[PDB]
Ligand binder design. Structure first.
Ligand SMILES: *N[C@@H](c1ccccc1)C(F)(F)C(=O)O
Ligand SMILES: *N[C@@H](c1ccccc1)C(F)(F)C(=O)O
Ligand SMILES: *N[C@@H](c1ccccc1)C(F)(F)C(=O)O
Lengths: 639, 634, 639
């Protein structure tokens, strides 16, 4: 299952200490994300050294002998006609040319350090002709938290942004470098602060430094790591959605999916069946539909019932794109490719980031699809007509005139989904004929990756809101159960006290179980609201069925005492709740994490924290990966 | 002409000191942009006080009498069937509910603009907000105090506007800036400016949030920038004509009279004027008179089709400006209080659809502007299309270690590519929102943000284009001086070697005809075009007529003398622009910004040079050379 | 008001008999549309003949004398360096090379081809082109004889290739096929033969003059803009009909709301709507509806109605502004070079660039998507009982709703229509390729854009047809509703008397009869679990308590039993009778009367044999062929 794969990714992200780069051990997207986000993670370049020196020595030797080789004894790009024996100055001129970005905004340090690792990895294959020593310098800069400041834009995929890494290595004074989060110094000073001296570029070295896909793939790696975690988070929370909305778990039955066997359909449903088996909320759901069965929907709306079919292509896109991105991480993306064993330089296009670009477009569409699912679920949850007993906007009230609940989060979810759908148009359809028409196809992979990343930022917001709304719903469902029991108690005991016959008592107790408590919580004894309406109906029917002056007297008394006692008793239990079925739920880790670890409570006019303050905490734990602890606790035992 | 209107906008932006907000005087996109960007610009709220207090008094009194008015004695949005007499509590619960954004922010410029636009809406006397709240808004604006507001959450501007209301009522969770250096909770910010937290009266929560102030705020600075960058692009089309050796006839008035799209006539009229007595157009005429029948009859589209192309772009940007200003000067609020007729009117003036739709159109027009720049830049970089200029505008002379503006060229493709992507519409992604109450919504703030991102890219593209054109000016000027040397060296050496008149004429024609940048790298290289032509001539002069000895001696003396004298004038160089209308631009970039001709001998990177030009564009210093260049156009 | 302008367009389209083509009288989008769609409409070329002949002889002389002029003594496009004295062969070679379309048949329709021939003929009258007058006469004759070349759909970046087929017809190319009327296709030489024409031999500049125009893009844009104006006015108008059926509050259109936010399209649409709804018999019912249980019902309408003027504003402005732009292009010399024979120069420019039309086509497609979304939102409210203020879900008459799903099929199709429409509204203009050996490094793509906007308008017609059909259903449901409520009242009133109930009981019961939405219990009026008997039971119990006996209870039980006997019979009778009025006082009467009487339809139900397709097809056909303008004009009479 993809579920097990994603769990392995989260484990690797958490547990990796050294990233070994040796030209043989694969670097995964978890490794890239770990390097970028966890400062205790170090790069260990293992001495493929012989292969590198061999390649490097071949290049220098051949260049000096006057061999004809692109970008070493030849001009660059559309200028490959121009030959030269000015080996170093040819390389320096390229870097000077490519230091051509503008600060408007920058590629963040996380992406720049990731790009550095990716470039370093490419070099390990022994095809590039770069000096081993430059590789050691990359390792040292990576482990010392040194990275150049890089302009956001200018790559069609990543000459310009990689030129800043080359600019660092040769100590260009105009190249500003970061050391940790605050220090910014010129490149020479930065090299000095970490025990390095500027390099003088040898044959092919300028080009080797710049002629890769390191930036597009760096962003695509963290994008894919996040896509995997958030995918699993959304699949998992579909079960939590089912629990609070009173869904029918049958939607995830294995025969339905065996019979329409998209791998992502089978796998998501398998997860969901397991999550909802033995659920105490599904137990309540079954109870709910047994009361007035033929007045209630036979099936759920699509946002739940159709989730495994919806998720299927989304699962598959995110999983296949991960593979594609990792193939690029672990490639010699460079040109020429030096085939030193066979004494030749091979002329190709390994710098072309098209596999990443196209998959970035696809993933952005899948992410939009995840957002739409979240939006549809959130929309059902806010509307009384579709929420099977829950109050509109998940407003606790009881005074709804001064409690609009999660209406602000509802509006925001629409704004999120809308921008997310816009973002999901492709970048790859906008290929311009570039660089004196030499680059007449180009991948735009970094631009695409950047947009998929922005889409995932919005998805995090939507997940944060959704999970916050669902924790509200858990509290509302547990309070609902407790309040219905109080109503039943009060109605039952007042029926006894008033000497009402069994017929009357049976009718009144049915109304107490049947009518949704949130339709009358605001004013429980309001003769205009559903509880008294149902009770008055039953009282007329009891009179007719039993048909007298004694009975009417007693029913009038039952009503006076209900008016005296019921509201206080409902207030007592709600005030107590404010100051249990989730305990048997597989989503307990999520609820406990949000309520206890993050320190939140049921949202109402009495809790002084704003919706912002609640959702911000949940968002921050999604953003910084702490959300994976309750996720992993929730899924332990599965397969 | 729109050119006058845009110059009027630039002047207003530069000259405004006080923005009077009085319920009658229009606020323009220049006023808004000036407030946002110039800290010395102050708001002056003019005591329209009478109509504010009447409206305010009417709302509170009716609400206390128990009149049934939406959002004053009723629930909000889809909850409008719930009635209540809890007047202040109703308003407070709205703000609480709307403090629902997340920091993953809208900038201070946008926030202050939103504050001004809300204050402006209130002056029309339809909102029922207290005058005192308006005074607090004016004081907050002049004191540089602004709430920190989350970027996202509006479908257009409830959530972002709730942070301004949060500040005004002293919500502890709301953080305010005081200048650029201070951040404090809202109550502390109010304290430091001598204000007390407000207690919301009837309709006051809703009045503060029920506007289009953030969408319209971002759209105002978007439109100011779009006008200025539009004029800049149109103007620079003329500089492009000059450096590329274009034919100015493309801007002839009859061509456009006969296809009279207003943007087409007006842009062409500007271009005709810019190029009228051009020294560079004089060179262009000289260039095409040499081997006339081996050279293009017409320019390629990026120049020749520029007025036709600019036409819808001018018109879209002009029309969108009108629309945005109408919104700036509107009572965007609901209910609308018609106190003169004793009624509250229920409608949808909070709906930012005029702004949203026009934001979609302008982003498409900005993409069209970027495409034009990209096409022009591409031509400039390719020797086949640049009429004598070297590839990548590389000075060399050693082209093997000078790749010129190739970096900038690649970047231009990246800029255009992302720009074209951005220009898809936001307005087609309408979701049925807020318990299906908001089943149409404008998404205007989101659209405005994307158009703003598009303009950021356009600024990058303009900075690059202008920088290349300055490079190209230097290269055209060097070219003229180099050709004169070649001619002089050829002429004097022909004399010394005592060659016949037949010979001297053939060689001097070659010296005038072959483009100098084809052979600058190695002037006497026998495989390069100068000596190729010279050898052709020498064979022809032999067929047409010792003579051989005098020709071989010529070729040896040229081989010794020429490159040295070419290097001399080049090194000296390291003028026609003095007579050009684009002199202010060249002088601005070269002298004021302190730059020079780009080459391997210049230590400054392309980044360093383009950054200065970009910064001047971003901060509006570029309008000085722009206004000088346009001086006298009417 | 734009309303006056559009009514003007419609009048002109219906009334024009001859389109005068004279070089100074403007051709409007209505004239183009009338030529394309009404075959009795004729072209009249008015002998401008002088300046034309001056121009063509000027060009011929200059060319013969060897003057250097692009495309006359010069190669084309990127080949303009090449000179030639081969005047006719040059023009012949252009046409041969431009005959390069492929039939996939998909083709530009005859309507667009004939419109394009008109527009080319028009450009020529300005006397800048150098075409012979006799070629112009030939074009007039082909137009008046209904002869058109068959033109491949694609190939233009805007209209060399498509226009080459008109040129191919004129010179008698055997490979060019021509239509004569609707039933005949013959090769070009035979088509010319049949209308008394001989093949032309191209003179200097004539091949180029024929092909170097924006004729096809502008032809499709003209009929697009004509349709966009009509459909816009229709949508605006039908917003008023929506208010009437949905029980809206006409206040949303009050002139002060819009004076205070004065976007011209906002004021003008609201002005129309205020007028349409003033003194409305349906608005009278709406006012009564909200006066009953006032405080249980929404204070404001949802956005699809109340925000319609604000939504329409930019849509109106875009469509009106694009009409001007397109008409400026229709009335232009789109050709190059432009011959200024007065001053003996050929001016070299780019009037063939269709950018003005291209960019506006993109804007209008966006505006049309906005119109679709407005209809989709309104339609959605109408289908949902929770938002329709008493109307049954899906506008199902029933009464047995288990076998009548009403307009659910139309509801589903409306989502399918809107979805594709929103997709179409992405820009074409952002996809500029550097074309024609990099000569055309900007190009408008106007024809491609115009085609997409036309497709968008096809879908909008479908949506309007559905929306109008639904609102006529709703009219019937509202009128039946009023009749049914009066019967319930009468039966309850008289039965209360006859059962000897007290006056306070009678009054309580009559309140229930007035207040309960009849469509909530029509299925089974005396079902004890449905809202009528629910309210009656509550009222009966309250009566017993208030007057608190055995006689009262007997009479109340009798009342319930007898209502159970009579009410359904009476309700069935008035419904059956209705299937066998306030619309008569409504400004929308001509729409209802057009759809019901002239198109021969009825209330939709399980008893009507016609499918929704059959009903919507008729309305769609009427929208497509302009018959819908008849009730539009009647409705708007006096505005
Ligand atoms: N990636 C291309 C290039 C273009 C300009 C400067 C450096 C590199 C290339 F295709 F030419 C290549 O390096 O192979
Ligand atoms: N703008 C809408 C609204 C919705 C929720 C909270 C505040 C405001 C509205 F349509 F209902 C309105 O204010 O008119
Ligand atoms: N429209 C262009 C052209 C290109 C190829 C064949 C005919 C015409 C042109 F720009 F070159 C022109 O005709 O002006």
């Amino acid at each position: 299952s993809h579920v097990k794969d994603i769990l392995g990714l989260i484990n690797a992200f958490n547990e990796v200490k050294k990233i070994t780069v040796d030209g043989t051990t694969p670097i995964t997207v978890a490794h890239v994300a770990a390097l970028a986000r966890r400062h205790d993670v170090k790069v260990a370049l293992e001495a493929c050294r012989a292969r590198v020196e061999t390649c490097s020595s071949w290049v220098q030797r051949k260049a000096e002998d006057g061999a004809d080789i692109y970008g070493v004894t030849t001009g660059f790009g559309a200028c490959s006609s121009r030959r030269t024996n000015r080996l170093s100055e040819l390389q320096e001129s390229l870097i000077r040319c490519l230091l051509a970005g503008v600060f408007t905004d920058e590629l963040p340090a996380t992406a720049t350090r990731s790009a550095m690792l990716l470039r370093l990895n490419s070099f390990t294959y022994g095809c590039s002709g770069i000096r081993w020593e430059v590789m050691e310098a990359l390792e040292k800069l990576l482990n010392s938290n040194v990275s150049p400041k890089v302009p956001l834009r200018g790559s069609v995929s990543d000459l310009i942004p990689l030129a800043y890494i080359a600019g660092l290595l040769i100590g260009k004074p105009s190249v500003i470098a970061r050391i940790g989060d605050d220090v910014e110094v010129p490149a020479p000073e930065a090299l000095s602060r970490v025990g390095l001296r500027p390099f003088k570029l040898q044959a092919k070295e300028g080009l080797a430094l710049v002629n890769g896909t390191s930036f597009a793939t760096a962003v695509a790696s963290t994008v894919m790591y996040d896509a995997n975690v958030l995918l699993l988070l959304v699949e998992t929370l579909c079960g939590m959605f089912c629990e609070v909305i009173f869904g029918r778990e049958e939607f995830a039955h294995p025969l339905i999916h065996k019979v329409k066997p998209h791998p992502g359909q089978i796998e998501s449903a398998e997860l969901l069946e397991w999550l909802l088996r033995s659920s105490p909320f599904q137990e309540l759901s079954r109870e709910y539909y047994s009361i007035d069965k033929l007045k209630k929907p036979k099936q759920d709306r699509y946002a739940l019932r159709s989730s495994p079919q919806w998720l299927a292509p989304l699962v598959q896109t995110i999983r296949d794109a991960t593979t594609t991105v990792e193939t690029e991480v672990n490639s010699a993306n460079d040109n020429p490719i030096i085939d030193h064993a066979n004494d030749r330089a091979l002329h190709g296009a390994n710098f072309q980031g098209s596999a990443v670009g196209f998959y970035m477009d696809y993933v952005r569409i899948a992410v939009a699809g995840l957002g739409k699912l979240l939006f549809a679920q959130f929309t059902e949850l806010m509307i009384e007509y579709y929420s099977n007993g829950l109050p509109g906007n998940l407003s606790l009230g009881p005074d709804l005139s001064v409690d609009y609940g999660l209406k602000g989060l509802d509006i925001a979810m629409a704004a999120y989904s809308s921008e997310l759908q816009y973002l999901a148009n492709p970048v790859t359809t906008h290929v311009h004929s570039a660089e004196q028409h030499n680059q007449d196809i180009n991948s735009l992979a970094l631009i695409s990756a950047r947009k998929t990343e922005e889409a995932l930022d919005i998805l995090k917001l939507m997940i944060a809101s959704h999970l916050t709304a669902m924790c509200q719903a858990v509290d509302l469902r547990q309070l609902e159960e407790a309040l219905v029991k109080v109503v039943e108690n009060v109605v039952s005991t007042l029926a006894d006290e008033c000497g009402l016959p069994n017929d009357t008592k049976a009718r009144l107790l049915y109304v107490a179980k049947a009518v949704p408590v949130y339709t009358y919580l605001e004013s429980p004894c309001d003769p205009t609201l559903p509880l008294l309406l149902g009770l008055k109906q039953s009282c007329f029917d009891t009179i007719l069925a039993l048909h007298t002056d004694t009975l009417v007297d007693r029913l009038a008394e039952f009503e006076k005492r209900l008016s005296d006692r019921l509201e206080n008793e409902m207030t007592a239990v709600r005030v107590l709740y404010e100051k249990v079925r989730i305990q048997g739920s597989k989503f307990l880790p999520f609820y406990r994490f949000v309520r206890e670890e993050l320190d939140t409570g049921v949202m109402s006019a009495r809790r002084e924290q704003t919706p912002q303050e609640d959702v911000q905490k949940v968002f921050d734990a999604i953003a910084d990966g702490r959300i994976t602890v309750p996720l992993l606790h929730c899924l332990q035992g599965f397969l």
